[PDB]
């Protein structure tokens, strides 16, 4: 239980490590895209690690990079087809970032570092945990941006907008690029205050 | 229908991609074997295939490079002079190597990858390394957590080394239990207070460790050593017990262990100035060699002193040896400060810690404390406390030769 | 001409690093020093200039819907082909430079392994699919996007070197303050948001 | 209290100078300290602040008497606390109001914003200093006044509090405080509102404090129909060049008067506090691009034919050039980079004004963009110097 | 020949009369240990010992062979040590006329003397310590040589003496010293002056260069930057004109010449002038019955680059040629930072005082403000005439980026080269201390 | 051992290809429906038909909507698969396209496809309104809408913007229902058969026939909307087709 939850506030892919930041900055305007994206990253990281481990002892070292990206690319392509067949609306919103899961440093980072020279099941759990931490960052950033940028959570009204006979004026910077940078930056500050072991020198 | 096209095209791209990479590798990457030159000697030249770290090729050959961490990258004992090759010094290498040393070719061998031809200028000491497996003679307990180790030289003569050196000991995997440890009744009584015999060390894989010598060069026949048992912290039981020291402690007469030759840099200066020795725990080994070396091997007339830190009388070993040397030569003197004498000790001498006993007695009124060489080796707490006092006396770092054994 | 308006579009109006959040991991990691930052940027320019037009040729000739045969559209192979092409062409570049151009390898070839399977390269081709680019157009777009990516990362390196005098609170030092810096940079790069 | 003792140190250092003596060489020190620099900049915008309050009240009065009259005008006055408070203290609201009534009305819009900016902004400055155990610096005095002078008179107070909070915290305090950041704090706070709540800091409902009045500004009017579209609908008169130069136009409280800003700019420039290389660079960049657009021409965009001297007196260009681009911390540090830093500001402002349809003015965006490249201009300058050094300066 | 415009002449009141007069008798003389950069003394004398003129007092552990010798003969009365047992001063009461002698030579023979012969005599007499190296302002190693020796025959420090007045008396000794330097240098000897005529050496090795303009036009660092840029590979030696006179006296008479001419000046100095004294003379005794009442600070050297003369450090420094006395300004002023200063001096034009040209100011030790982070308003670039970027160089020093500081020219600088930057800094940073820290790291790593 | 590497590469490649080619090919039909049904909902929304659920949207659309192709030049219907027709592709491809002149490009649209697709709202075998899809450039993005015109060809039944990237609060208020509701009852043409719909800055008179309130603080977006109805109600848009609709 401790192993799976480790990459959440101890070796989080975005707070301690710098991995999967491109998605965390681009699909966090709504929780629906942030939620579905994280589930995909767990599906790919867990499965890519599992398959890499099984054929790790036989992978050719010369072209191991090609062999690994093929597994990830195949899985991400399948995930893209599923999102089109079901959840086409969300799939359209994610745009080119569903395919960018391939280059997501989290997927490759675990694949080379852990899926290799490891057993399948532990490597699978390694992927599940990493996505959970990656998902935690996407939820926190996505929660604040959607709530303050639109007055809604998961598309549900939580703050009636003055335009819709409400009382809350939306903040337009929450829907733009800089806000995601600030939220993660302040998110890191909070984590390293309650866990001062992560402070850099 | 389209699935057939999808399958065929999918493979054709991958096969084309790998073939281009593999085809490019043959005509672009030179697969010829690398040639490594050591000190420029044609015989010492080492030919190793591309790939792997520098220490790998050197270890197989007749030149052995000291590596306390065994390639861990955080020991600094793999410093070698790379005249040519090896690229530029890595940013991590600068952590253990100063900028000035980098200009001289000082590089971490374990951190350097052999990917092309290179030139090396390994020193004579690194070149002059011989593998020996001495037969353990004595493993008596000098103190509560200290043992005196006697080693029988396999091929006669004695290990060639300078005073204060160490021998890198390597042992295979074994399960040694603290019960097998043999202790005298004098020290066994204190052991029963905590009953450390319940521990059971399990050395899964071979390990490498260093142990300072405890015999000056003229002491031919036995490579005397002092070993301190490694145990989990009393306040932190969740730590593995001693692995190498426990294995060595478990040994007795008849057992043999490898020493991989001598190494070290804890050498005194050949000058005409006063010398100060501050030993602790296993640190008594270099002091005994240094004291023996100066008194008889060199017959130096320079003033000498010794300040060993101990807690109780039972801890204090080699007391007779120092008393004889002190009586034998007036220039050499020794004193001990008891941190916490036992009720039966009835101590009536210096009491407390040496970091204050030494200053309040000798250094405080010393005319020129800076004009002294301070050789210190002991527990980390002693080293930290003593360093602050010596700095407060205006003592240059060059005159403080710390040799902490952990 | 049309190409010039495209080049200025892909350097300032379209910014991969700040406007599309692509290549952030290396953008925030190799931004410590200007010299190394200027190095990775050039490699990104080279890889984009090679990767984008080459994938354009493959896409039109092979992966384009209905182009190869009537009723057969190999579009679902898009992701594997682009990533596979970029990965292959970068590795060979690291080899030709090392064998034949030592000085260039130590100057630009060192960063190529970082540019392998990088987000900025893949994202650039991905937009080049959702947009119709002619081969010459794709060359300019590939070149311009990498140039603009270099501008952001080189600009970040200047700010971080200036920050040697900063007194950042512990817990924000390093990654946390860098994210804020990038956000403040994104604010200044929104001055061409409305341009065409 | 130990924590409140630090704050008392700032107060004591404010009323009385410290009695500290030098602890080493140099044993004598220059008279100038950071305190005197800040107050000179603070006093340099006083002429623009006073005219701004007069201008804001004048525009509001003229528009109010042009929309309403008689009983309707009376009801409008009673509805808004800004209006009757002016009448309560002894100020008329008719079309015969004097400069005192016009100034007084403007003060009811500026003082609350400046007070809101100061209290909320100062709280963050003190909080960071107390927790991190630092002495309060005088930089906030300049930051608070400048931020309050570059916002519309109608800005909601809660939005003003947010803007100063963003600039002080996100742009300055996390970096270590005054002198330790790279971005212009006042403009960072303005950019926050610019993008967070664009409805309140743009359009035709925020630049005049007359309730129910809609009027475009000069920059907007020119972009619509060129020089001939410059009309004050609250007075029916053409906006002449001298009108923009003096400041008889709607806009931000402190930006309107190019003449008033120049007088303050001259003083700090003469005193050596404001770099003249930066100001000279801004003029070069603006003039070169404005004339370039004039020569190129355009049959669809009216901004192409705006001359340099019209760019000078419109929008926030003069205020930005004199008091924002001259921020020493966020500008370049080398003399050569200052010329380039100014030129980039001048070029960018004209570019955004003429090419970016989304925003009629670009001085705030231009300076923020230029702040990102000031360290690079210095980098190119020093590397050239390093090469000269490694050649022994040709010796 | 070289004119400087970026600089600042401090118009501090009390400039010396520029006439040499006999000084108060000096009974205590000391050697200041902390003013020799990177020096770890090895004592050759204990308290109560009797010392001759040029007898060694202590050696340097980190510069083997360099002897620090007594300026006078007498008895050692105290060996002052501060925190961490750092040698503050070695005080010697003056008594007797016993002196260690040395070999003498004729004036014409000096230029032809062997380099090792010159070195041995200079080191033995202790006069070797007059030289300092750029970089690092250290005493040159005995086994080292330089192709460029700079002679500072000018002084643009505030309240400084006029070297022409001092040198004119010792014309024969000054020229004799130049001939000795001519043989000592592997390359040239650079004589830097203010354009007025000086005694001139007839050797082609010695070159005269004129510097005109405000301070630091007279600092050796300025002269090296324009005539012989220094780096890790190129090292120059600096020596002031009075030490050059001592060099000539030593090789002409075989006796150590410890007489010095210093300017006693300052606002609180009743009759500022030039007074004859001895090396390391007690400053408390030198300024007795010459200072106005009040709490004052006595400084060895200038107000820009000098040492506070109090307690252990109350003696004339080796490289100092002036004593400046000022008031200690502890007066808190109500809104003083906001008043119009007719009597306040500044490099900026933000005070009324700059309008009254020719005004002199009764400067005190007041900081004129509190410590703040650097806000760069171009003050550094107005007083720094070298081809450098002072704002970036100073920020590297403030940040501790020693590697960056070296690239920006830190190796060309001494503490005195950054005094004007310290004077004009709005944040009240002390850059001389920061430079020394950076230079210590660069030497320790190298 | 290239023999082993090729076996792994081929073996791994074949398994990956089979899954990828099976998933994309098998799911293609479902994906096409998901996109096909997405647009149908917007048309049903502006048509006035309330549809909830995927099944209802398909059922109602196939029962009360009738896609049809039209030629802008001739203003007459043309034969083809109206349901399966990407008008945007036609506009891009020079095949069916016209590079509009600067004067004619009132809505700032680069091209205009030769064939346009409308959606007749059949009611008991009789058309009740025509939903014209129009588009024009805004301040940030290109804005697409559906305009529902009554049988007379003048009255407007409704308007919906189904794709726009304008700033929320300022320019995105084209999707505000109150603003959309303001379009019902207006007239696209005057008695002279010339476009008359006006986006009036500062609001429009109450009870007006061709006047629509502008977007507050969003003149540039409002100008784009005004431009859109100028071009698409002109001779080069639906002017020919709409004129035909008026006379049966
Ligand atoms: C140059 C040099 C000379 C030395 N000379 C001597 C000498 O003369 N005498 C001497 O006694 N020592 C000496 N040492 C120390 C030596 O390296 C060992 O620390 C010591 O021999 C004990 O060996 P160990 O591995 O069993 O204990 P260590 O593991 O090294 O001791 C560390 C502590 O952690 C515990 N521990 C054991 N295994 C682990 C593990 N896997 N992970 C974490 N904690 C663990 C140990 O019980 C102990 O409490 C020297 C070291 C050096 C570098
Ligand atoms: C101290 C402040 C700075 C001092 C600057 C010194 C003067 C700088 C002059 C810049 C060059 C002349 O600037 C000139 O300005 C006039 C306004 O009269 C413009 O006058 C006109 O010209 C263009 C065509 O060229 C017309 O389409 C347009 O209506 C208008 O801009 C000129 O186009 C421009 O060339
Ligand atoms: C000439 C001058 C101009 C300044 N301009 C600004 C400004 O535009 N905005 C601001 O927030 N602070 C300004 N300041 C205050 C301060 O320098 C600035 O906030 C720095 O960025 C703080 O490090 C200015 C100070 C001076 C001396
Ligand atoms: C020396 O100059 C300054 C002051 O004068 C003493 C201040 O007072 C403040 C802060 C002002 C206010 C109103 C903060 C209110 C909140 C708290 C917690 C004190 C600042 C920033 C300042 O620079
Ligand atoms: S996820 Fe790391 S570069 Fe995009
Ligand atoms: S072997 Fe220890 S660092 Fe290399
Ligand atoms: Na104006
Ligand atoms: Na514009």
Describe what you observe in this structure.
The PDB classes it as membrane protein. Keywords: quinone, membrane protein. The complex is a heterohexamer of chains A (201), B (406), C (196), D (395), E (446) and F (248). Chain C has 196 residues and is mostly helical. Chain C has nine helices and no strands. Chain C has helices at residues 2-13, 24-29, 34-63, 78-100, 102-109, 112-115, 119-130, 135-162, 175-188. In chain C, 61% of the residues are buried. Chain D has 395 residues and is mainly alpha-helical. Chain D has two domains: 2-16 and 32-200, no CATH class; 275-383, no CATH class. A two-stranded antiparallel ribbon of chain D has the order 1-2. In chain D, α2 (34-44) runs antiparallel to α12, α6 (99-132) packs across α8 (157-173) and α16 (335-355) packs antiparallel against α17 (363-371). Chain E has three domains: 2-20 and 102-253, no CATH class; 21-97, OB fold (Dihydrolipoamide Acetyltransferase, E2P), CATH 2.40.50; 370-446, no CATH class. Chain E has eleven helices and 19 strands. Chain E has helices at residues 115-125, 163-169, 171-184, 220-227, 241-253, 283-286, 379-383, 390-399, 402-407, 419-424, 431-445, and strands at 2-3, 20-22, 28-32, 41-43, 50-51, 56-60, 67-69, 74-81, 87-94, 132-134, 148-152, 188-193, 206-212, 236-240, 259-265, 273-278, 296-301, 306-308, 322-327. Chain E has a six-stranded mixed beta sheet with strand order 1-13-12-11-14-10. Chain F is 36% helix and 21% strand. Chain F has helices at residues 2-47, 54-64, 87-92, 177-181, 219-232, 239-246; strands at 66-71, 76-78, 115-123, 126-137, 142-150, 156-163, 198-200, 211-213. Chain F has a six-stranded antiparallel beta sheet with strand order 2-1-3-4-5-6. In chain F, strands 7-8 form a two-stranded parallel ribbon. Chain F is elongated and about 85 Å long. At the A-C interface, α2, α4 and α8 of A face α2, α4, α7 and α9 of C.
């Amino acid at each position: 239980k401790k192993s799976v939850l480790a990459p959440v506030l101890d070796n989080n892919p975005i707070a301690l490590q710098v991995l999967g930041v491109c998605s965390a900055l681009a699909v966090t305007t709504k929780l629906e895209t942030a939620f579905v994206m994280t589930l995909a990253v767990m599906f790919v990281t867990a499965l890519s690690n599992f398959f890499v481990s099984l054929i790790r002892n036989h992978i050719p070292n010369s072209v191991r990079i090609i062999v690994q990206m093929a597994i990830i690319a195949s899985l991400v392509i399948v995930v893209d087809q599923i999102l089109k067949a079901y959840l086409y609306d969300i799939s359209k919103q994610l745009s080119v970032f569903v395919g960018l899961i391939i280059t997501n440093c989290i997927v490759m980072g675990r694949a080379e570092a852990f899926a290799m020279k490891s057993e399948p099941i532990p490597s699978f759990i390694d992927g599940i945990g990493n996505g959970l931490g990656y998902g935690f960052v996407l939820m926190t950033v996505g929660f604040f941006r959607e709530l303050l940028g639109s007055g809604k959570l998961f598309g549900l009204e939580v703050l009636p907008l003055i335009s819709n006979g409400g009382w809350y004026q939306p903040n337009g910077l929450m829907l733009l690029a800089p806000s995601a940078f600030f939220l993660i930056g302040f998110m890191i500050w909070a984590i390293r205050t309650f866990k001062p072991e992560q402070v850099e020198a | 229908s389209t699935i057939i096209f999808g399958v065929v095209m999918f493979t054709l791209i991958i096969l084309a991609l790998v073939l281009v990479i593999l085809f490019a590798k043959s005509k672009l990457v030179p697969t010829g074997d690398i040639t490594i030159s050591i000190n420029g000697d044609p015989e010492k030249a080492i030919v190793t295939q591309p790939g792997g770290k520098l220490l790998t090729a050197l270890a197989g050959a007749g030149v052995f490079v000291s590596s306390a961490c065994g390639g861990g990258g955080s020991c600094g004992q793999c410093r070698v002079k790379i005249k040519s090759g090896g690229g530029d010094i890595l940013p991590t290498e600068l952590d253990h190597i100063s900028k000035g040393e980098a200009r001289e070719g000082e590089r971490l061998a374990c951190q350097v990858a052999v990917k092309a031809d290179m030139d090396l200028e390994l020193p004579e000491e690194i070149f002059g390394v011989k593998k020996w497996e001495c037969t353990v003679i004595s493993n008596d307990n000098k103190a509560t957590f200290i043992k005196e180790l006697k080693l029988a030289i396999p091929d006669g003569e004695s290990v060639p080394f300078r005073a204060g050196g160490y021998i890198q000991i390597e042992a295979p995997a074994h399960h040694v239990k603290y019960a097998d440890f043999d202790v005298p009744e004098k020290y066994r009584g204190d052991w029963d207070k905590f009953n450390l015999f319940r521990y059971e060390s399990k050395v899964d894989e071979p390990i490498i460790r260093a142990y300072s010598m405890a015999n000056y060069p003229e002491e031919f026949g036995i490579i005397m050593l002092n070993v301190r048992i490694a145990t989990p912290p009393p306040n932190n039981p969740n730590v593995p017990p001693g692995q190498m020291s426990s294995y060595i402690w478990s040994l007795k007469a008849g057992d043999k262990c490898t020493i991989s030759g001598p190494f070290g840099e804890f050498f005194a200066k050949d000058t005409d100035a006063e010398m100060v020795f501050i030993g602790g725990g296993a640190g008594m080994a270099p002091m005994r060699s240094h004291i023996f070396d100066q008194l008889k091997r060199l017959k130096s007339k320079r003033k000498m002193s010794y300040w060993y830190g101990a807690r109780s009388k039972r801890e204090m070993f080699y007391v007779e040896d120092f008393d004889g040397l002190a009586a034998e030569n007036d220039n050499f003197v020794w004193h001990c400060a008891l941190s916490d004498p036992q009720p039966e000790d009835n101590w009536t001498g210096y009491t407390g810690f040496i970091h204050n006993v030494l200053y309040e007695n000798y250094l405080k009124d010393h005319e020129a404390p800076e004009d002294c060489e301070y050789y210190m080796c002991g527990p980390p707490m002693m080293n930290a406390a003593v360093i602050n006092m010596l700095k407060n006396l205006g003592v240059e770092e060059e005159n403080i030769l710390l040799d902490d054994f952990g | 001409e049309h190409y010039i308006s495209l080049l200025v579009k892909s350097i300032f109006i379209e910014n991969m690093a700040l406007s599309f959040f692509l290549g952030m991991c290396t953008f925030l990691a190799v931004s410590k020093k200007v010299k190394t930052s200027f190095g990775l940027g050039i490699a990104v320019i080279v890889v984009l200039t090679i990767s984008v037009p080459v994938n354009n040729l493959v896409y039109n000739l092979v992966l384009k819907p209905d182009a190869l045969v009537e009723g057969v559209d190999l579009s679902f192979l898009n992701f594997i082909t682009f990533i596979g092409v970029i990965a292959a062409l970068v590795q060979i570049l690291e080899m030709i430079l090392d064998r034949f151009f030592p000085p260039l390898y130590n100057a630009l070839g060192i960063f190529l392994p970082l540019i392998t399977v990088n987000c900025a390269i893949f994202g650039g081709v991905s937009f080049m699919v959702q947009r119709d680019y002619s081969f010459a157009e794709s060359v300019v777009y590939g070149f311009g996007s990498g140039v603009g990516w270099m501008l952001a990362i080189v600009a970040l390196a200047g700010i971080r070197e200036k920050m040697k005098y900063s007194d950042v609170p512990p817990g924000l030092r390093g990654l946390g303050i860098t994210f804020i810096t990038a956000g403040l940079m994104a604010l200044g790069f929104m001055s061409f948001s409305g341009v065409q | 209290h130990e924590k409140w003792f630090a704050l008392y140190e700032a107060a004591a250092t404010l009323f009385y100078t410290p009695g500290l003596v030098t602890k080493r060489s140099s044993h004598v020190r220059d008279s100038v300290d950071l305190k005197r620099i800040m107050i000179m900049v603070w006093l340099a915008v006083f002429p623009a602040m006073f005219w701004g309050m007069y201008n804001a009240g004048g525009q509001a009065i003229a528009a109010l008497n042009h929309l309403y009259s008689g009983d309707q005008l009376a009801a409008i006055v009673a509805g808004n606390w800004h209006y009757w408070l002016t009448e309560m203290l002894g100020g008329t609201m008719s079309s015969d109001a004097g400069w005192g009534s016009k100034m007084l009305l403007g003060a009811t819009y500026f003082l609350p914003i400046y007070a809101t900016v100061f209290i909320v902004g100062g709280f963050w400055e003190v909080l960071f200093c107390m927790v991190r155990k630092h002495e309060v610096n005088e930089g906030f005095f300049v930051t608070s006044i400048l931020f309050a002078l570059i916002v519309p008179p109608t800005l909601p107070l809660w939005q003003a509090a947010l803007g100063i909070t963003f600039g002080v915290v996100v742009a300055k305090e996390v970096f270590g405080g005054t002198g330790r950041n790279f971005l212009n704090p006042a403009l960072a706070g303005r950019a926050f509102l610019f993008f967070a709540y664009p409805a309140q800091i743009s359009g035709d409902l925020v630049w005049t404090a007359a309730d129910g009045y809609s009027g475009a500004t000069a920059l907007s009017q020119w972009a619509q129909g060129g020089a001939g579209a410059l009309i004050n609908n609250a007075t029916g008169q053409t906006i002449t060049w001298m009108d923009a130069f003096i400041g008889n136009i709607p806009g931000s409280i402190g930006e309107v008067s190019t003449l008033a800003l120049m007088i303050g700019a001259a003083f700090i420039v003469y005193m050596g506090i404001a770099s003249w290389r930066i100001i000279g660079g801004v003029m070069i960049g603006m003039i070169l691009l404005s004339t370039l657009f004039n020569v190129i021409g355009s049959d669809t965009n009216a901004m192409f034919n705006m001359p340099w001297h019209w760019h000078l007196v419109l929008g926030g260009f003069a205020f930005g050039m004199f008091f924002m681009a001259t921020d020493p911390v966020s500008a370049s540090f080398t003399n050569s980079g200052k010329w380039a830093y100014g030129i980039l500001i001048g070029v960018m402002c004209v570019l955004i004004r003429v090419v970016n349809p989304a925003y009629p003015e670009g001085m705030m965006l231009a300076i923020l963009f230029a702040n990102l490249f000031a360290p690079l201009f210095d980098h190119v300058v020093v590397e050239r110097n390093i090469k000269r050094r490694l050649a022994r300066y040709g010796k | 020949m070289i004119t400087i415009k970026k600089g600042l002449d401090l118009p501090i009141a009390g400039t010396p009369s520029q006439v040499i007069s006999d000084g108060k008798a000096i009974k205590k003389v000391a050697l200041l240990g902390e003013e020799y950069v990177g020096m770890r003394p090895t004592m050759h004398v204990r308290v109560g010992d009797e010392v001759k003129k040029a007898q060694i007092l202590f050696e340097d552990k980190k510069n083997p062979g360099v002897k620090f010798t007594s300026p006078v003969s007498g008895k050692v009365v105290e060996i002052n040590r501060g925190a961490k047992r750092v040698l503050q001063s070695v005080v010697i009461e003056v008594a007797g006329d016993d002196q260690v002698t040395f070999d003498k030579f004729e004036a014409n023979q000096l230029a032809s003397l062997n380099r090792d012969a010159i070195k041995t005599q200079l080191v033995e007499s202790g006069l070797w310590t007059a030289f300092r190296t750029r970089p690092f302002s250290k005493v040159p190693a005995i086994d080292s040589t330089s192709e460029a020796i700079f002679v500072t025959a000018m002084d643009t420090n505030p309240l400084a003496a006029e070297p022409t007045v001092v040198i004119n008396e010792q014309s024969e000794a000054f020229v004799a010293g130049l001939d000795v330097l001519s043989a000592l240098t592997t390359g040239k000897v650079y004589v830097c002056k203010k354009g007025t005529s000086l005694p001139r050496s007839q050797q082609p090795n010695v070159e005269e260069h004129v510097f005109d303009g405000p301070h630091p036009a007279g600092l050796a660092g300025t002269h090296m930057h324009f005539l012989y840029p220094v780096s890790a590979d190129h090292v120059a030696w600096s020596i002031n004109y009075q030490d050059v006179i001592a060099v000539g006296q030593l090789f002409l008479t075989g006796e150590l010449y410890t007489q010095r001419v210093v300017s006693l000046a300052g606002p609180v100095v009743n009759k500022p002038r030039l007074v004859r004294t001895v090396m390391g003379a007690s400053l408390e005794q030198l300024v007795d019955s010459e200072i106005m009442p009040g709490e004052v600070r006595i400084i060895s050297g200038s107000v820009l680059s000098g040492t506070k003369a109090t307690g252990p450090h109350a003696y004339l420094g080796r490289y100092h040629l002036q004593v400046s006395v000022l008031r200690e300004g502890r007066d808190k002023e109500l809104f003083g930072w906001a008043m119009p200063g007719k009597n306040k001096f500044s490099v900026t034009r933000s005070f009324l005082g700059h309008l009254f040209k020719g005004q002199v100011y009764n400067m005190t030790t007041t900081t004129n403000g509190s410590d703040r982070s650097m806000v760069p308003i171009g003050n550094y670039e107005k007083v720094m005439p070298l081809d450098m970027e002072p704002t970036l160089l100073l920020r590297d020093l403030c940040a501790g980026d020693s590697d960056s500081a070296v690239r920006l020219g830190a190796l060309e600088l001494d503490e005195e080269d950054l005094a004007l930057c310290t004077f004009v800094c709005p944040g009240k940073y002390e850059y001389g201390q920061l430079l020394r820290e950076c230079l210590d790291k660069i030497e320790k790593e190298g | 051992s290239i023999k082993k590497t090729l076996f792994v590469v081929i073996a791994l490649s074949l398994v990956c290809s089979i899954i990828v080619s099976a998933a994309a090919v098998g799911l293609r039909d479902k994906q096409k429906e998901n996109a096909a049904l997405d647009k149908q909902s917007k048309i049903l929304q502006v048509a006035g038909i309330e549809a909830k659920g995927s099944k209802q949207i398909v059922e109602l659309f196939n029962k009360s909507i009738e896609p049809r192709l039209v030629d802008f030049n001739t203003g007459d219907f043309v034969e083809g698969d109206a349901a399966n027709y990407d008008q945007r592709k036609a506009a891009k491809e020079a095949s069916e396209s016209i590079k509009l002149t600067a004067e004619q490009d009132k809505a700032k649209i680069q091209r205009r496809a030769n064939v346009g697709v409308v959606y007749l709202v059949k009611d008991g075998d009789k058309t009740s309104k025509v939903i014209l899809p129009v588009h024009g450039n805004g301040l940030w993005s290109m804005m697409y809408a559906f305009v529902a015109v009554e049988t007379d060809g003048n009255t407007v039944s409704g308007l919906t913007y189904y794709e726009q990237g304008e700033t929320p609060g300022l320019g995105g208020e084209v999707e505000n229902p109150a603003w959309r509701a303001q379009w019902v009852g207006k007239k696209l043409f005057d008695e002279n058969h010339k476009p008359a719909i006006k986006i009036v800055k500062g609001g429009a008179p109450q009870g007006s026939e061709h006047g629509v309130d502008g977007l507050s603080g969003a003149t540039l977006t409002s100008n784009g909307v005004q431009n859109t109805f100028d071009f698409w109600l002109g001779d080069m848009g639906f002017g020919p087709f709409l004129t035909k609709v008026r006379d049966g």
